[PDB]
Structure 1
Amino acid sequence: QPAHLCFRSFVEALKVDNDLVEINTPIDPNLEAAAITRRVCETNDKAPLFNNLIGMKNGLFRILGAPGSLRKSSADRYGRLARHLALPPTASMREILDKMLSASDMPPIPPTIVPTGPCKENSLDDSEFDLTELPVPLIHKSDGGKYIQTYGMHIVQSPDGTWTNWSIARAMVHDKNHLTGLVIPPQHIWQIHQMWKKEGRSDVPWALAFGVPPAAIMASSMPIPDGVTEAGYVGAMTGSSLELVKCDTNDLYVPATSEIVLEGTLSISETGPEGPFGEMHGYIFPGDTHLGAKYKVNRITYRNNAIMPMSSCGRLTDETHTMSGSLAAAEIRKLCQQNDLPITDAFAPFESQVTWVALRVDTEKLRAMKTTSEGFRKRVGDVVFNHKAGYTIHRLVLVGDDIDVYEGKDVLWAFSTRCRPGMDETLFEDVRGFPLIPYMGHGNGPAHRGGKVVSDALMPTEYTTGRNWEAADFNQSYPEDLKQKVLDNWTKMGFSHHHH
């Protein structure tokens, strides 16, 4: 049970890393837990483990906040993510996204069924649990319900049994034995729900597993292709078949060390009030009156001393940014490569509220295409904005070889100086839009359509003969021998650790 394969092991890894704060005094799930977690995410502090949660009863539950948020140091900024994947805590974004993409051209390693696991240590039936009596957090003061589900994985399977999807989608407590949640196109939970609704025979067999293997929650957050079972993708990525146990009340399979498992159904007919919720872009519209999907809970199984992970999402920086934004970027990089586009790297700048993706271009391959900005912009746009991987992304910024797209400042520099507004852009109004972005859902135009752009920050010679500028910076506007002299004499002259 290594950290990347066992949530309990992961929590011990964060403690050992000095990247955990154990709070053992009573904390209120009504806003206090989430407020502390929000402050953590805004300051890149240590992850909070709430061992003493007002209203925890019969082992349900402790909370771990900020499971995938950032560390303060530059040197191990992404160490929490690295700990999800068995990577060194010093891993770069590139290394993390490469790991997440590694299984894309490997044969799946399907999961291994085991008779039991720690998730079966405790159970509560139909008659023994009430979801309104559990210490479910109120995460933001105007939230329209207590969001039990911010970092567990929904498990649904196609009617024909050939595709089992694992994904994060939010869900809140509706009553003693129901949740309501987001189930929206083009998301795979929605695609599978549609399959069941067209068969029209029954409600969707469903499970929701919290505190799953960290590598599985990463894949849960990533738009891997339609029809690809996350379990086998994680198996290939890690090199280890995941151990799953059967649900007690249906024939779905859950990670054996899951902290907490809900078993039940996702309705093909019923809805209920859902949200509003304080969301990845940084907003809540109090009183929004949306309907969402309705889940019925038949059973709860859980580990002794069960830990619920929780994302207190909103303004920078949390799991919606570090995981949902970055993993969409990774999938867009691959999608571009598979469509023969000379894209080396992609990242969703945090500064853009992960609504942009910067696409680094191999300009030597670009030159060999003998194309133009308008033609290339359109082709990139068509590929990414007509695919599910481009769903959440409203601006693509194309940048040449000199720009590190993992560095927001360099993306903003290139964008601001190399893309002429209007002329160097193409607008896409007949593509699916992401309604959660306030200028979509709460804006001047159609909530679900358009509002997308490809901004070309490639300079004209980058299409023809090659970069025709040097940066007016220390790196490029001074010869190596001089730069090294300045650096060697810096403190001697009177000017002012990598880890620290």
Structure 2
Amino acid sequence: YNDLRDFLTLLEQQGELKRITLPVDPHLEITEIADRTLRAGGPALLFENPKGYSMPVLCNLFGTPKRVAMGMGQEDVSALREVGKLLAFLKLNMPTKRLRGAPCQQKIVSGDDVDLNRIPIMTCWPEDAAPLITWGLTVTRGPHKERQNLGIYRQQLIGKNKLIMRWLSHRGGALDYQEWCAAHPGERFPVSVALGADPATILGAVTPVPDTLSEYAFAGLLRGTKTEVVKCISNDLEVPASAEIVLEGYIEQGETAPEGPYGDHTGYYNEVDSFPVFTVTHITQREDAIYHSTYTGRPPDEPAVLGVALNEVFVPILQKQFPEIVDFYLPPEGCSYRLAVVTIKKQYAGHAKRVMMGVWSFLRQFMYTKFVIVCDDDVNARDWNDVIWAITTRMDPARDTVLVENTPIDYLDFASPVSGLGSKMGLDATNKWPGETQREWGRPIKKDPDVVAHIDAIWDELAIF
């Protein structure tokens, strides 16, 4: 049973983990180092000597797509499509195996002894309001079913034992809380947060499984074995037995705090807003605990890289519905969800428009995607040289652009005319068939596949780089 430490050893053996012994400040400096590292596609980083703390800080864990694949037990990034077919089928799944004891409860501190200032919580960007917890798996139950939701919600430090719980309203945690308030007026909402669980559990948290299903069950499928958990000390929620640190407590109904500003995955600061306060009554941890953290900012960042790997999971699901789709890609540069490029085997005049409408309606992850570019299958969706070529040689802008107004848009997207509402643009860059054009369309240059294959074979021997 691989916990997180086993994963770090695996990475270190493969030159995918680097230990920093120099003094480095959790205030701003770690983010700067990790940002350079990620942008050059370097290793995961373990800062063994954070200025002013004894607990090492692990970050950039999932800063390459390879390391996301490795964290699901697979060799490479193409294996992620198979986990996508699996995800199709859930739309008996395996419960958790509850241990009687666990390393994450070796050292326990509670009540007045709780001090989150002892943890090397990072400050990411210069005008961020305060230190911010960024890799917490938040565990909740609602009042109406047994299912335990795991989510990643950022958490601002506001006291020795107070965090802000910044879940957006469509998240599992926020729905569970909202229902608890209606169904049990005035009663404290139990909550627990696990830091540094095994990678299958972490990636399971972030994969959008149904709300009906526990993210613990999915992680079991990725792992091949049941997720090992332990009952929390102060509530009936279960947390991963291998966790490095666990926070337990509750949300007092009505209690809220102004959150942020914080730099966001779009590369801008979110302005201040109110969210629930999470009161921390217990902090449990391993001997030798490692603090797992990250940051978001201008893309690409670790979330963006996670998001590119998880898009591979969705390709199969889309292809099941739309078998004409050859590839489907959401570039990191587009803030991970705002632009999609789709390639198809076009079969009839107008086909591109059906595909756009499918991207905008089929799955909710893409409901808010404001640019969609559709191309033929001779275009590599992942290369702007091909995509721009297609746009500039197969479109007449006014004929081939679809605009739709008053559509749902992310409420934090300041570029839309009104919060929550905006337009979308679809670019039909497919070759135009009779009916779509009265001109003689051009015959595109295709490569000889035998020449390509021969050059693949002798490429290393050629030794050009």
1:173 is aligned to: 157
1:443 matched to 2:437: no
The partner residue of 2:22 within 19, 22, 25 is 25
Aligned to 1:381: 360
Aligned residue runs from structure 1 range 441-480, under 5 A: 442-461=414-433, 471-472=444-445, 476-477=446-447, 480=450
Matched, 1:395 2:379: no
Corresponding position: 1:156 with 2:140 = yes
Q: Tell me if structure 1 keeps the 8 A contact 2:53–2:118.
A: no
Q: How far apart are 1:222 and its partner, in Å?
A: 2.2
The aligned runs of 1:192-207 (5 Å cut-off) are 192-201=176-185, 202-207=187-192
Mark the CA change 1:244 to 1:443 in structure 2 (over 3 Å): closer, same or farther: same
159, 167, 191: which one aligns with 1:183: 167
Provide the rounded CA distance (Å) in 1 between the counterparts of 2:435 and 2:208.
31
The equivalent of 2:58 in structure 1 is 64
Amino acid at match of 1:352: G
Shift in CA distance, 380/312, structure 1 to aligned 2, threshold 3 Å: closer
Shift of 1:52: 1.5
Query: How far does the alpha carbon of each residue in 1:222-257 deviate from its partner, in whole angstroms, 9 at most, with x for none?
Result: 222232211111212322110010110010000100
Deviates more, 1:289-298 or 1:413-422: 413-422
CA distance in 1, matches of 2:326, 2:434: 15
- 2:213: which partner in 1? 228
Q: Deviations over 1:353-372 (max 9, x none)?
A: 31222233343xx54xx754
- Residues 283 and 43 (structure 1), Cα distance of their counterparts in 2 relative to 1, 3 Å cut: farther
CA distance in 2, matches of 1:48, 1:279: 22
Q: Distance in 1 between matches of 2:236 and 2:461?
A: 67
Superposition RMSD on alpha carbons, in Å?
3.2
Contact 1:373–1:424, Cα closer than 8 Å, also in 2: no
Q: Is the 8 A contact 1:381 1:454 kept in 2?
A: no
What is the Cα deviation at residue 453 of structure 1?
Answer: 3.2
Greater mean alpha carbon deviation, residues 253-262 or residues 109-118: 109-118
* Cα displacement string for residues 456-486 of structure 1 (whole angstroms, at most 9, x for unaligned residues): 333333999xxx76544xxx25684599589
What letter is aligned with 1:164? Q
Q: 1:233 to 1:390 in 2, by over 3 A?
A: same
SS of corresponding position for 2:23: coil
Q: Which residue of 2 aligns with 1:75?
A: none
Report matched runs for 1:361-372 at 5 Å.
361-363=344-346, 366-367=347-348, 372=351
Q: Which residue of 2 aligns with 1:432?
A: 408
Matching residue of 1:52: 49
**Cα distance in 1 for residues equivalent to 2:385 and 2:177:** 41
Q: Which residue does the alignment assign to 1:346? A: 328
Following TM superposition, by how much is the alpha carbon of 1:412 offset from its aligned partner in structure 2, in angstroms? 4.5
Query: How high is the TM-score relative to the length of structure 2?
Result: 0.88
Distance (whole Å) between structure 2 residues aligned to residue 166 and residue 259 of structure 1: 16
- Does the CA contact (< 8 Å) of 2:50 and 2:120 recur in 1? yes
Q: How far off is 1:54 after superposition?
A: 2.3
SS at match of 1:192: helix
Describe the shift of the 1:101–1:293 C-alpha distance in structure 2 as closer, same or farther (beyond 3 A).
Answer: farther
Distance 1:68 1:400 in 2: 32
The alpha-carbon deviation at position 337 of structure 1 amounts to: 4.7
SS at match of 1:39: helix
CA–CA distance in structure 2, aligned partners of residues 238 and 170 of structure 1: 26
Name the SS for the 2:422 alignment partner.
coil
Does residue 74 of structure 2 align to residue 80 of structure 1? no
After superposition, the Cα gap between the structure-2 partners of 1:418 and 1:156, relative to the gap in structure 1 and judged at 3 Å, is farther
Within 1, Cα distance between the matches of 2:383 and 2:345? 17
Deviates more, 1:11-20 or 1:425-434: 425-434
Distance 1:43 1:482, change over 3 A: closer
Structure 1 residues 186 and 433: CA distance shift in structure 2, 3 A: farther
Residues 53-112 of structure 1, C-alpha deviations (whole Å, 9 max, x = no match): 22325xxx2111111102xxxxxxx32112211111xx13x4224335524415422211
Q: Which amino acid aligns with 1:161?
A: K
| Of 294, 312, 330, the match for 1:311 | 294
Residue in structure 2 matching 1:139, options 116, 120, 124: 124
Residue 422 of structure 1 deviates from its aligned partner by 5.0
Aligned amino acid, residue 66 of structure 2: G
Q: Distance in 2 between matches of 1:275 and 1:200?
A: 30
Q: Which residue of 2 aligns with 1:126?
A: 111
Q: Is the 8 A contact 2:119 2:291 kept in 1?
A: no
Aligned letter for 1:170?
R
The offset of 1:133, in angstroms, is 4.2
Give the distance between the partners of 2:356 and 2:135, measured in 1 at CA: 36
Q: Which amino acid aligns with 2:332?
A: F
- Provide Cα deviations, 1:339-382, integer angstroms capped at 9, x if missing partner: 5564344321123231222233343xx54xx7544454334423
For residues 162 and 482 of structure 1, the distance between their equivalents in structure 2, rounded to whole angstroms, comes to 55
- Tell me which moved more, 329-338 or 221-230: 329-338
Aligned length in residues: 459
Amino acid at match of 1:274: E
* Equivalent residues in 2 for 1:284-299, closer than 5 Å: 284=269, 288-299=271-282
How far apart, CA to CA, are the structure 1 residues paired with 2:392 and 2:181? 47
Q: Determine the C-alpha separation between the residues in 1 that align with 2:354 and 2:454.
A: 43
Percent identity of the aligned residues? 24
